[PDB]
């Protein structure tokens, strides 16, 4: 049903994209609107399938009383229809969430839903939905003649990982497109230089990867060795220094790193 106010001349309406989105009946002379029916905007929240088989569903930008109308739930299987209504129906600003129990606490975010709401698989186990926590509340004891001085300290060691290079790949155009067929390869000559161009773009990437490694690692040009007596004031560097009992120059920490990346 429509509330569009036409003129006595007109038969149908058009939106921005020039699609017909309203129409007039040629018999009863009434105006009625047209709307698609698919509803693609469905998101499925899961933990692992090695954890559970429970899910929650988010219907995007939809009010929670229009969910069986929007997805046309009466023409669906009964295993879909349990995710259109029920007790676990919760309305966010991202849409309507069905299948999760809304709690009152706040936790650090696990699965982001949107607009401040996260979801977790938490204690029988269930899926819960909460407002997320920014952090622990604090207060400083500010005064105009008070100061805090530290009396001890901690030595801290942390870790930072950075990517340096990627895989150098190469493509032969003619074997991909026209694989050892000379009827096909003579037809490919009429498209010009599309494959001289694609080959030199990949060659400039592969040269750039070796330059990326030089700028990080080859910063000095003296190969320094460490002395055989390890007298460093009590500091012990044996797990990061090279272990000579291997075919490699690798240390103990460097060996734990090369076995945790799956090439």
């Amino acid at each position: 049903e429509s509330n569009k106010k036409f003129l006595p001349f007109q038969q149908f309406g058009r939106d921005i994209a020039d699609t017909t989105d309203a129409v007039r009946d040629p018999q009863t002379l009434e105006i009625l609107d047209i709307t698609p029916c698919s509803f693609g905007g469905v998101s499925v929240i899961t933990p692992g399938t090695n954890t559970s088989n429970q899910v929650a569903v988010l219907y995007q930008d939809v009010n929670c009383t229009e969910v069986p109308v929007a997805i046309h739930a009466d023409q669906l299987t009964p295993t879909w229809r349990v995710y259109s209504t029920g007790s676990n129906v919760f309305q966010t600003r991202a849409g309507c969430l069905i299948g999760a129990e809304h709690v009152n606490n706040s936790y650090e975010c696990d699965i982001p839903i949107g607009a401040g709401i996260c979801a977790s698989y938490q204690t029988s186990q269930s899926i819960i939905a909460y407002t997320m926590s920014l952090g622990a509340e604090n207060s400083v004891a500010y005064s105009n003649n008070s100061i805090a001085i530290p009396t001890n300290f901690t030595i801290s060691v942390t870790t930072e990982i950075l990517p340096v290079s990627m895989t150098k790949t190469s493509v032969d155009c003619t074997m991909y497109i026209c694989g050892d067929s000379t009827e096909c390869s003579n037809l490919l000559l009429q498209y010009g230089s599309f494959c001289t161009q694609l080959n030199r773009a990949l060659t400039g990437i592969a040269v750039e990867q070796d330059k990326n490694t030089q700028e990080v690692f080859a910063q000095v040009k003296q190969i320094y060795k460490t002395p055989p007596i390890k007298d460093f004031g009590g500091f012990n560097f044996s797990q990061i220094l090279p272990d000579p009992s291997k075919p490699s120059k690798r240390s103990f920490i460097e060996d734990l790193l090369f076995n945790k990346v799956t090439l």
Binding site: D15, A17, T19, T35, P36, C37, S38, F39, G40, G41, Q60, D61, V62, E66, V69, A70, R93, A94, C109, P112, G114, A115, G116, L134, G135, N138, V140, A141, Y142, S143, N144, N145, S146, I147, A148, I149, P150
Partner: protein, 98 residues
């Protein structure tokens, strides 16, 4: 029954994860930390210091001795308050800085 995820030929807009009220909570915690603690809260726990003493060690860090701050304290505080009012005066005019 206005389902506006259907009215735009497949194009939608997704909401951000942090709201505007959560970003304003983050910037006010960063500002209460600098005013009461200086630079200590960014390297560990927050240690309180009076605000004129904190502005005296920042004068030391640019090469001015700290008596120049304490001997000129009301002049320096009045110059700061007038420059904050000039920021706000030019943002509430029709000149658009963003």
């Amino acid at each position: 029954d206005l389902i506006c995820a259907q009215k735009f030929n497949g194009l939608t807009v997704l909401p951000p994860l942090l709201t505007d009220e959560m970003i304003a909570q983050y910037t006010s915690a960063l500002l209460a930390g600098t005013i009461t603690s200086g630079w200590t809260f960014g390297a560990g726990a927050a240690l309180q210091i009076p605000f004129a003493m904190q502005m005296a060690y920042r004068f030391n860090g640019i090469g001015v001795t700290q008596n120049v701050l304490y001997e000129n304290q009301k002049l320096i505080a009045n110059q700061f308050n007038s420059a904050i009012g000039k920021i706000q005066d030019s943002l509430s005019s029709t000149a658009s800085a963003l």
